[PDB]
Design an enzyme around this catalytic site. Structure first.
Site, PDB file in Angstrom:
ATOM      1  N   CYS A 197       3.279   1.678   9.353  1.00 25.57           N
ATOM      2  CA  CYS A 197       3.182   0.447   8.527  1.00 25.57           C
ATOM      3  C   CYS A 197       4.581   0.039   8.066  1.00 25.57           C
ATOM      4  O   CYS A 197       5.421   0.903   7.812  1.00 25.57           O
ATOM      5  CB  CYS A 197       2.201   0.605   7.381  1.00 25.57           C
ATOM      6  SG  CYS A 197       0.487   0.586   7.958  1.00 25.57           S
ATOM      7  N   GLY A 254       2.025   6.212   9.358  1.00 26.89           N
ATOM      8  CA  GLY A 254       3.478   6.122   9.096  1.00 26.89           C
ATOM      9  C   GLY A 254       4.132   4.910   9.747  1.00 26.89           C
ATOM     10  O   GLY A 254       5.335   4.643   9.433  1.00 26.89           O
ATOM     11  N   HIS A 289       0.845  -1.225   0.000  1.00 28.56           N
ATOM     12  CA  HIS A 289       0.000   0.000   0.000  1.00 28.56           C
ATOM     13  C   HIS A 289       0.870   1.262   0.000  1.00 28.56           C
ATOM     14  O   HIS A 289       0.275   2.379  -0.081  1.00 28.56           O
ATOM     15  CB  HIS A 289      -1.055  -0.006   1.102  1.00 28.56           C
ATOM     16  CG  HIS A 289      -0.559   0.249   2.475  1.00 28.56           C
ATOM     17  ND1 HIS A 289      -0.389  -0.777   3.384  1.00 28.56           N
ATOM     18  CD2 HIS A 289      -0.289   1.405   3.126  1.00 28.56           C
ATOM     19  CE1 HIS A 289       0.033  -0.277   4.527  1.00 28.56           C
ATOM     20  NE2 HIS A 289       0.076   1.067   4.404  1.00 28.56           N
TER      21      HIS A 289
HETATM   22  C1  LIG Z   1       0.018   2.200   7.892  1.00 27.50           C
HETATM   23  O1  LIG Z   1       0.902   3.148   8.342  1.00 27.50           O
HETATM   24  C2  LIG Z   1      -1.364   2.497   8.527  1.00 27.50           C
HETATM   25  C3  LIG Z   1      -1.454   2.067  10.046  1.00 27.50           C
HETATM   26  C4  LIG Z   1      -2.707   2.548  10.786  1.00 27.50           C
HETATM   27  C5  LIG Z   1      -2.828   4.199  10.761  1.00 27.50           C
HETATM   28  C6  LIG Z   1      -3.506   4.524  11.856  1.00 27.50           C
HETATM   29  N1  LIG Z   1      -3.197   3.383  12.877  1.00 27.50           N
HETATM   30  C7  LIG Z   1      -2.652   2.187  12.073  1.00 27.50           C
HETATM   31  O2  LIG Z   1      -2.331   1.136  12.524  1.00 27.50           O
HETATM   32  N2  LIG Z   1      -2.344   1.666   7.748  1.00 27.50           N
HETATM   33  C8  LIG Z   1      -3.485   2.273   7.119  1.00 27.50           C
HETATM   34  O3  LIG Z   1      -3.708   3.440   7.223  1.00 27.50           O
HETATM   35  C9  LIG Z   1      -4.361   1.397   6.336  1.00 27.50           C
HETATM   36  C10 LIG Z   1      -4.167   1.769   4.798  1.00 27.50           C
HETATM   37  C11 LIG Z   1      -3.463   0.387   4.109  1.00 27.50           C
HETATM   38  C12 LIG Z   1      -4.450  -0.398   3.719  1.00 27.50           C
HETATM   39  C13 LIG Z   1      -5.663   0.434   3.634  1.00 27.50           C
HETATM   40  C14 LIG Z   1      -5.271   1.918   4.319  1.00 27.50           C
HETATM   41  C15 LIG Z   1      -6.267   2.298   5.571  1.00 27.50           C
HETATM   42  N3  LIG Z   1      -5.725   1.711   6.638  1.00 27.50           N
HETATM   43  C16 LIG Z   1      -6.367   1.375   7.886  1.00 27.50           C
HETATM   44  O4  LIG Z   1      -5.665   1.162   8.819  1.00 27.50           O
HETATM   45  O5  LIG Z   1      -7.796   1.313   7.900  1.00 27.50           O
HETATM   46  C17 LIG Z   1      -8.329   1.839   9.084  1.00 27.50           C
HETATM   47  C18 LIG Z   1      -9.861   1.785   9.049  1.00 27.50           C
HETATM   48  C19 LIG Z   1     -10.538   1.657  10.243  1.00 27.50           C
HETATM   49  C20 LIG Z   1     -11.919   1.617  10.259  1.00 27.50           C
HETATM   50  C21 LIG Z   1     -12.618   1.743   9.077  1.00 27.50           C
HETATM   51  C22 LIG Z   1     -11.950   1.880   7.873  1.00 27.50           C
HETATM   52  C23 LIG Z   1     -10.573   1.917   7.838  1.00 27.50           C
END
Ligand SMILES: *[C@H](O)[C@H](C[C@@H]1CCNC1=O)NC(=O)[C@@H]1[C@H]2CCC[C@H]2CN1C(=O)OCc1ccccc1
Ligand SMILES: *[C@H](O)[C@H](C[C@@H]1CCNC1=O)NC(=O)[C@@H]1[C@H]2CCC[C@H]2CN1C(=O)OCc1ccccc1
Lengths: 304, 304
Positions: free
Chosen positions: A145, A143, A41
């Site tokens: 991930c 950030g 991603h």
């Molecule tokens: C990567 O850095 C990020 C980690 C998240 C950010 C906030 N806390 C955490 O652990 N990952 C994401 O933001 C992912 C991204 C990759 C795959 C799809 C997007 C959205 N996402 C995500 O974490 O979805 C959260 C969410 C929660 C409830 C409803 C919808 C989406």
């Protein structure tokens, strides 16, 4: 004396963290030999993350589109490929700090250390359990991930986890280092259900043995039980059923303390039915299930 | 999302740990530049530790009597001296892995990371608070002495703690790196009292702000209070009195959440008087006081 949630020393893993940038998106990558591993991603704009076609998105990307930074220095990307939900970026330089390592797909109920990273720099280290519903209870912001989970066995690092996302319950989901998610999760911005968060029964028992070893024994009662009898009470409380393999795993702790596993089970049953009555065990007011039997032996015997 | 007890990354400190042996006694030493720091009780036999005369015991010791081992290799001791409760062994080789560092005597209520070591090898890393009664709640066995506590500020390691002993309550006591004990403790085998274990009020409030930032807000009530009114209830529960400097320290968290510090104090007061009613805050069934306001900001903003 004393019993703490304790991470592995992170030094060997700190030396493998890099920053990976595509367009506007920066996250963490794991640099082992001449390969950098990161969440696919990284290629997504904020639009893309609703219903991304990763195959189509990746096709627009060339080697030079991936900026890989090892602290100060830029690595040269000489090849890229997608494996499940992770990107493998081939770089022209073997990481000179590559430790002895393995990739392992860890079992539910097993624990590991998370090195939480931002922009390829370590923020902090904490222990997590891979929960029966294949979530973890971590601490992750935007950030984070590409942050990884690992075990150490003497000098060998076993990487078991890469961080990809947050669920609506505030728990976390990710992949093994082959890019296969733990549990039913997908890398897109949809509401995703982990199911019932079942308690890791064998780990609760391990921690009650930890408590007895550390001199906390107020909860030890005068009764015993049977696996079938205990499990009837486990079921009601969303505990994993206790099996003979679990009894075998607890055998060394049972022996060291002289408390039969089924006698400890009877203690647990009364704690589930009666609660703690405002009392604490190893400084906790609830039953802790994120210590494995091995974690208890490791910690109570000073393994290095 | 999520809030965890999180240690600093330990890599910089792993590189400074050595093994120090006198006679039969082995413990950990900290190798910085051409000096190894370790607990002076390395010189004691089991007889000596009841009422040791360290000056008299040390007088029988020469440079060659101290075996210092940096992993595989033997360091050459070219001088020794006692400073308070620590030994300074001068070695003929500057540690090439010496990080930028400071020695700091930390204040009660401040937190630090412990790298638990045995035979000069890292076992694990966890966060501790220097408690108001100058104890810590660690995990230490025989051979752990010389293990250190530290903070990191970007690339600079602030060493604040060296481990020397266990108290009858199962809590731990040690020195700064100048060898001065935190609290009223002495390095001999006697029953030693830490007094009343007072709760770090400003840290509990920081953690309630952490809970609100992370979406846990069930405990927020409709009342406010005054410092003098809150403190009357603090006193009863062995909480540290809240002062204006504490209110100032919580100001950025108050601002970020829009909850006035005295409104959060009113919430805390009701939790102290009513308990949790079987509810949890950030997955805990009791009030946590081992996060500083800085720890909360650091963790909730991804500082690296
Ligand atoms: C990567 O850095 C990020 C980690 C998240 C950010 C906030 N806390 C955490 O652990 N990952 C994401 O933001 C992912 C991204 C990759 C795959 C799809 C997007 C959205 N996402 C995500 O974490 O979805 C959260 C969410 C929660 C409830 C409803 C919808 C989406
Ligand atoms: C150093 O490795 C050791 C650390 C201890 C061992 C068990 N848990 C832990 O933290 N320190 C000691 O063993 C010290 C030693 C140095 C100074 C005097 C001796 C005894 N000792 C100690 O910890 O005293 C424990 C004690 C508890 C109750 C009553 C008497 C003595």
């Amino acid at each position: 004396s004393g019993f703490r949630k304790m991470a592995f020393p992170s030094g060997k893993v700190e030396g493998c963290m890099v920053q990976v940038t595509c367009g506007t998106t920066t996250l963490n990558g794991l640099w082992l030999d001449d390969v950098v591993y990161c969440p696919r991603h990284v290629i997504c704009t904020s639009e893309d993350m609703l219903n991304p076609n990763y195959e189509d998105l990746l096709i627009r990307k060339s080697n030079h589109n991936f900026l890989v930074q090892a602290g100060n220095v830029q690595l040269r990307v000489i090849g890229h490929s997608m494996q499940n939900c992770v990107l493998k970026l081939k770089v022209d330089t073997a990481n000179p700090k590559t430790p002895k390592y393995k990739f392992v797909r860890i079992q539910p109920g097993q624990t590991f250390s998370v090195l939480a990273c931002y922009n390829g720099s370590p923020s902090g280290v904490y222990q997590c359990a891979m929960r029966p519903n294949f979530t973890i209870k971590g601490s992750f912001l935007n950030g984070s991930c590409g942050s990884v989970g690992f075990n150490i066995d003497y000098d060998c690092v076993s990487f078991c986890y890469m961080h990809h996302m947050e669920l609506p319950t505030g728990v976390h989901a990710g992949t093994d280092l082959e890019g296969n998610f733990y549990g039913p999760f997908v890398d897109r911005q949809t509401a995703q259900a982990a199911g019932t968060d079942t308690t890791i029964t064998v780990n609760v028992l391990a921690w009650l043995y930890a408590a007895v070893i550390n001199g906390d024994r107020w909860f030890l009662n005068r009764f015993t039980t049977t696996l079938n009898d205990f499990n009837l009470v486990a079921m009601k409380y969303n505990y994993e059923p206790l099996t003979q393999d679990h009894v075998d795993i607890l055998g060394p702790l049972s022996a060291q303390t002289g408390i039969a596993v089924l006698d400890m089970c009877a203690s647990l049953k009364e704690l589930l039915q009666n609660g703690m009555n405002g009392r604490t065990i190893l400084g906790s007011a609830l039953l802790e299930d994120e210590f494995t039997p091995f974690d208890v032996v490791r910690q109570c015997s000073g393994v290095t």
